[PDB]
């Protein structure tokens, strides 16, 4: 039983053993959540009227990797969107012969309930060139839809960079893709040099895009890109990268390697809430890729006096009062 509520009060972790949390608040009174499962082998979906309710909602496996061929490798970081009356899931997948040969793919469901509904594959979402491609998100602004994602440029020594492009329908991009972020500070390079997990927040006349950098261990952290929402978002000079991490490990709250966030709101739409993953310990045994204990958690997004986002530090486990309406 998930009863609705206008206050947002959560117990972290909200969902254990789920990395890359994506939470979308729909017009039907429900939060929808997708994420990476530790086996990297399926797409699970759950819904709840409240954020905290996600801890007890029954998850459904809606899609499983192919026995062989494309979409037969790793299954990473799906995001469920609602666009033009239809559900879409953007996710990254490798092949059976190379689990790590990752491209973008899209699913679509026309039924109103996406848990019970019928899901249909729509194939790969190609970009300007074939390479390591992952973590596509989409947003709309001033009547134009965009794709923001991470991709390997063979001419650049980084696992991936952040790209933007205009879209032509929810299933394709158009034009040239534009690089708006590449690893350049040392905090983007501990372990491996990486920018990935772009996430879009629109507020205060600006478009904010957080991203994650460094390896997926305790060194994982987040940086910020900002642009004015009246600029040319395909112009790389529209995007300013904050020089320092905007979110990182905090040993005093016991939260390590936080990142790959998404953004949602309270039910009334008035506060912004960041949903992300972190571990509650520092040292990892084996390859960090198969440590399954990145846990999904949430905390409020605060706002500086000047209107830039204040992400603060990962809150300690336990209860967290995010929002009580005045
Ligand atoms: O998103 C692609 C990679 O695999 C995921 O599980 C992680 O979030 C990231 O490093």
């Amino acid at each position: 039983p998930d009863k609705a509520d206008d206050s947002v009060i959560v117990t972290n972790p909200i969902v254990r053993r789920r990395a890359d949390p994506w939470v979308y608040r729909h017009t039907d009174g429900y939060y929808y959540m997708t994420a990476s499962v530790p086996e990297y082998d399926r797409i699970e979906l759950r819904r709840s009227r409240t954020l905290q309710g996600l801890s007890t909602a029954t998850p459904k496996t809606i899609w499983r990797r192919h026995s062989s061929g494309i979409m037969g490798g790793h299954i990473w970081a799906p995001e469920i969107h609602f666009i033009d009356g239809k559900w879409y899931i953007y996710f990254s997948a490798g092949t059976s012969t190379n689990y790590f040969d990752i491209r973008l793919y899209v699913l679509e469901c026309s039924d109103s309930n996406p848990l019970t509904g019928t899901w249909v594959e729509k194939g790969q979402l190609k970009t300007n060139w074939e390479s390591f491609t992952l973590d596509a998100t989409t947003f709309e602004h001033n009547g134009t839809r965009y794709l923001v994602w991470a991709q390997k440029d063979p001419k650049i020594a980084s696992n991936s960079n952040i790209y933007i492009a205009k879209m032509n329908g929810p299933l394709a991009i158009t034009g040239n893709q534009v690089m708006i972020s590449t690893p350049e500070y040392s905090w983007e390079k501990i372990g491996y040099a990486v920018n990935e997990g772009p996430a879009v927040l629109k507020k205060n006349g600006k478009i904010f895009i957080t991203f994650s950098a460094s390896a997926t261990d305790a060194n994982y952290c987040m940086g910020l890109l900002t642009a004015s929402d009246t600029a040319n978002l395909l112009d790389p000079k529209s995007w300013h990268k904050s020089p320092n991490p905007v979110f990182q490990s905090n040993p005093s709250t016991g939260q390590y390697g936080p990142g790959h966030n998404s953004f949602t709101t309270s039910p009334d739409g008035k506060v912004d809430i960041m949903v992300y993953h972190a571990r509650n310990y520092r040292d990892i045994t084996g390859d960090p890729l198969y440590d399954p204990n990145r846990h999904t958690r949430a905390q409020i997004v605060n706002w500086n006096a000047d209107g830039t986002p204040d992400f603060g530090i990962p809150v300690a486990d336990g209860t967290n009062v995010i929002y009580i309406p005045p």
Side-chain angles (χ1 to χ4, degrees):
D2 52 353
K3 195 213 180 292
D5 184 2
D6 245 291
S7 309
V8 177
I9 305 100
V10 298
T11 284
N12 288 309
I14 304 190
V15 185
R16 281 182 302 109
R17 308 179 81 252
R18 291 298 186 270
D20 316 313
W22 168 271
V23 167
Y24 163 69
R25 172 77 182 173
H26 192 42
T27 57
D28 65 352
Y30 285 99
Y31 289 94
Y32 290 82
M33 180 174 149
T34 53
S36 297
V37 297
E39 303 79 25
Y40 305 132
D41 73 347
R42 64 202 197 273
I43 298 174
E44 81 160 16
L45 178 63
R46 76 181 69 201
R47 74 175 185 180
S48 169
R49 307 231 184 224
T50 65
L51 213 45
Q52 178 52 43
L54 296 170
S55 60
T56 63
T58 295
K60 173 84 171 166
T61 292
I62 52 168
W63 187 92
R64 296 188 175 263
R65 65 182 181 210
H66 290 187
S67 149
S68 89
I70 52 174
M71 282 171 288
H74 286 324
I75 310 297
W76 285 353
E79 301 176 8
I80 179 165
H81 294 250
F82 196 80
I83 294 179
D84 304 330
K86 298 178 183 183
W87 298 104
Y88 296 87
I89 292 183
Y90 297 81
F91 69 106
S92 319
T95 68
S96 59
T97 58
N98 186 359
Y99 275 43
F100 297 86
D101 190 33
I102 303 300
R103 299 301 181 272
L104 306 166
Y105 297 84
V106 189
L107 309 179
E108 188 229 88
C109 174
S110 288
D111 303 300
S112 74
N113 183 324
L115 286 297
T116 59
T118 299
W119 285 94
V120 167
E121 300 166 5
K122 304 305 271 202
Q124 180 182 351
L125 203 167
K126 309 204 169 187
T127 60
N128 289 176
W129 68 86
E130 297 282 359
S131 77
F132 190 69
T133 305
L134 74 169
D135 292 354
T137 190
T138 180
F139 73 102
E140 196 172 34
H141 184 61
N142 281 330
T144 303
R145 175 166 301 285
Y146 302 85
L147 198 78
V148 188
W149 74 97
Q151 180 160 14
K152 168 67 169 185
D153 184 352
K155 295 169 194 163
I156 303 176
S158 73
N159 288 75
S160 66
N161 320 284
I162 306 303
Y163 296 95
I164 187 177
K166 286 185 183 192
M167 298 190 81
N168 175 10
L171 299 188
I173 66 159
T174 182
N176 294 318
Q177 75 193 57
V178 169
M179 195 184 84
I180 60 180
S181 188
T182 199
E184 86 196 42
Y185 298 95
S186 51
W187 54 263
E188 313 187 58
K189 318 189 183 184
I190 303 176
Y192 309 119
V194 195
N195 290 170
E196 60 181 7
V200 177
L201 175 58
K202 301 184 298 183
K203 214 76 173 316
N204 304 326
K206 295 171 188 144
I207 303 197
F208 301 106
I209 302 191
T210 57
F211 62 99
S212 301
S214 294
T216 59
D217 65 19
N219 294 293
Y220 217 58
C221 66
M222 271 167 45
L224 179 65
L225 313 169
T226 304
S228 160
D229 71 9
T230 68
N232 174 22
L233 306 182
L234 305 202
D235 185 355
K237 300 171 182 179
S238 292
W239 298 97
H240 166 68
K241 177 191 285 185
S242 286
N244 306 289
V246 301
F247 208 64
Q248 49 193 318
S249 298
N250 187 275
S252 87
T253 56
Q255 298 296 322
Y256 298 97
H260 208 290
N261 71 301
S262 67
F263 294 111
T264 196
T265 54
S266 50
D268 68 12
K270 290 188 163 177
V271 301
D272 303 301
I273 303 165
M274 187 168 74
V275 184
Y276 64 99
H277 73 223
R279 292 184 176 89
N280 58 38
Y281 55 86
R282 181 171 161 276
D283 298 4
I284 297 181
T285 283
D287 15 353
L289 173 61
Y290 299 101
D291 172 311
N293 293 311
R294 292 172 299 173
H295 303 310
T296 287
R297 60 214 318 277
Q299 70 192 75
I300 196 174
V301 168
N302 294 302
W303 294 105
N304 305 309
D306 67 347
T308 37
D310 183 357
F311 299 111
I313 74 180
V315 298
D317 282 338
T319 305
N320 181 19
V321 175
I322 282 177
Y323 172 68
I324 304 178

